[PDB]
């Protein structure tokens, strides 16, 4: 699809068996999801943005379905105000910015 | 252009006759730039990101070139960690997300 940017580019995702709404975010290096359980091991990480940093749990090799497209990668879990799909997974679904 | 996301989507902007680097950010509602001088009056704004909220200076109707495309619109100035071009100006330059 072609998504214009008049409104936030929100899509439905499936992660850990859960359906969620997330933001397709070209400014995010990483994918960051609101607090939830995921299987497997994790390690702590700090990520920073406007407003400063938050502590997250880093889970590797997590499968996510993004608007119907499957991708695998690292997912950070923590107290983000919004679910964010970052470049690590946008690349896998073939997303580009066009103008 | 068609910009892939394997690297940060950084472009050159020109504002106040100065070149700067900025991130094309579909996750940003607004455009936020590091401390600089802009003409005219400003108004207060609070913006919220990953780490919390910050105060910024809102300048309206600012002329800004983005990757060679002319835009005229609102620029927020404050302690952002990177210059971010948000959807208010991405729509002016005709940008879409495609996958
Ligand atoms: C600030 C940029 C460089 C990074 N951020 C991604 C942004 O797209 C962020 C994504 C975001 C969106 C909403 C709330 C919090 C974060 N947007 C944002 O802060 O936009 C602000 C300016 O316009 C306003 O509209 C949205 C909030 C304001 S982020 O959320 O802090 C972030 C995400 C993944 C990350 C990361 C930081 O570090 C490593 O991987
Ligand atoms: Cl990854
Ligand atoms: Cl590619
Ligand atoms: Na894992």
Give me the sign of the Cα torsion angle B89, B91, B92, B93.
positive
SS3 B97: strand
Which residues are B56's β-sheet partners?
B45
Distance, CA A81 to ligand 4 centroid (Å)? 23
Ligand 1: which of B8, B30, B49 to mutate, judged by most atoms within 8 Å of the beta carbon?
A: B49
Residue nearest to atom 17 of ligand 1 (CA): B28
B50 vs B30: CA distance, rounded Å: 15
The verdict on the CB of residue A56 being under 6 Å from ligand 1 is no
In this structure, what CATH number is given to the domain that contains residue A77? 2.40.70.10
Question: Considering its fold, how many domains does chain B have in total?
Answer: 1
- In chain A the beta strands, taken as DSSP E runs, fall at 2-3, 10-15, 18-24, 32-33, 43-49, 52-66, 69-77, 84-85, 96-98
Backbone angles phi, psi at B65, to 5 degrees: -95, 130
* Closest atom of ligand 1 to CA, residue B26: 8
Which residues are A76's β-sheet partners?
A32, A58
Other CB atoms within a 10 A radius of the CB of residue A43 amount to 9
Domain encompassing residue A85: 1-99
Report how far apart, in Å, the C-alpha atoms of B82 and of each of A60, A67, B24, B85, B98 are: 27, 29, 11, 10, 24
Whether residue B38 lies within 8 A of chain A, CB to CB, comes out as no
User: In the PDB record, what is the listed experimental method?
Assistant: X-ray
Whether residue B68 lies within 8 A of chain A, CB to CB, comes out as no
Q: Note the residue count of chain B.
A: 99
């Amino acid at each position: 699809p072609q998504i214009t940017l008049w409104k936030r580019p929100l899509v439905t995702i499936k992660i850990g068996g859960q359906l969620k709404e997330a933001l397709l975010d070209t400014g995010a290096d990483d994918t960051v999801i609101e607090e939830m359980s995921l299987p497997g091991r994790w390690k702590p990480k700090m990520i920073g943005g406007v407003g400063g940093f938050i502590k997250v749990r880093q889970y590797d090799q997590i499968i996510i379905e993004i608007a119907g497209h499957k991708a695998i990668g690292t997912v950070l879990v923590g107290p983000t105000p919004v679910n964010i799909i970052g470049r690590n997974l946008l690349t896998q679904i073939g997303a580009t910015l066009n103008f």
